[PDB]
DNA sequence: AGCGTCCAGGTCTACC
DNA sequence: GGTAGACCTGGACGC
């Protein structure tokens, strides 16, 4: 297919959004386990599917530059203002990250130290269905393997969009495409392990028991506590996966995922231990208490502070 | 030399 | 509700 674009080579095809590097670092966000579907196909340029089309993104010191491949056999052109608005919404640029970093650092000297080296880590606003099934794939697993799982799931069950160079881009599958009893066996062939059943059973539960796709919008409109409880009915969704979906797709900025990294960060970097349980190791009660500890420390956007520490912990 | 253990964005099941 | 251990997969890497 046609080439993945670079800004300096094809300037007529790009348009900018005001966005300083203090507000966003693509290299610290897009490969860090929020979305699994972006790749640095040219140095400093990240390509992936965003609002149903492929985009490439790159940045200068003060701007986020964007290019879109419409794949409808139309003539190439720069993104329009209306298309750029989808990118601005995906990066939630109405939230001023530099102010949150100052708040978090004022209450937490450890955060302040890490933040100095990890500027521009913000939270993507993701599609609920993509986020749900990506995080079902994430449990007891590592980011490189999760990334492959998600790519193979999309290639097998999602619509083909376009090919750039030798990369064929697919959209994320629908609920219906993931729900049939033949799907688990295919996802097992694709190496999803025991999560193959969780993916297909969760798609069937949403369609057959929760009222279909509108349930995810209902959870976006519900409180954090209500949304988190509701997601936990799904096979493969426990309190951590539910917190990931709440934070990253359901607009719950105080949701704090607690995985292996955040548990070890609490112990190593905060000397924290639970005080609501005599036994101190990970457990439902202690993982719950740890989420509450980080909310109490960082405030109503505690999940966003978690994303900074998580991204940094991947690099150490 | 390469096997085998540890480990990774945890959840489920069984049992008390 | 608390506790404990199994669990698909494959890269890191000690022995
Ligand atoms: Mg569940
Ligand atoms: Na609903």
Residue numbers in the entry: 10 to 325
What does the article say, verbatim?
The human 8-oxoguanine DNA glycosylase 1 (hOGG1) is a bifunctional DNA repair enzyme that possesses both glycosylase and AP-lyase activity. Among DNA repair enzymes, human 8-oxoguanine glycosylase 1 (hOGG1) plays a central role in the base excision repair (BER) system acting against the strongly mutagenic 7,8-dihydro-8-oxoguanine (oxoG). To trigger the glycosylase reaction within a crystal, we created a pH-responsive mutant of hOGG1 in which lysine 249 (K249) has been replaced by histidine (H), and designated hOGG1(K249H). Thus, the hOGG1(K249H) mutant is a monofunctional enzyme with glycosylase activity alone.
As the hOGG1(K249H) mutant is almost inactive under basic conditions (pH >7.0), we crystallized the hOGG1(K249H)–DNA complex under weakly basic conditions (pH 8.0). In this way, we obtained a catalytically active hOGG1(K249H) mutant crystallized in a complex with an unreacted substrate, and determined the 3D structure of the pre-reaction ground state of the complex. The 3D structure of the complex was very similar to that determined by Vedine’s group. The oxoG base was flipped out from the DNA duplex and bound to the catalytic site of the enzyme. The H249 residue was located within the catalytic pocket, but the distance between Nϵ of H249 [Nϵ(H249)] and C1′ of oxoG [C1′(oxoG)] was 3.9 Å. The distance indicates that a direct nucleophilic attack of the Nϵ(H249) atom to the C1′(oxoG) atom is unlikely even if we consider a conformational change of the side chain in H249. On the other hand, a water molecule was found within a hydrogen-bonding distance from Nϵ(H249) and Oγ of S147 [Oγ(S147)], which may indicate the catalytic role of the water molecule. In the ground-state structure of the hOGG1(K249H)–DNA complex, no proton-donating residue can access the N9(oxoG) site.
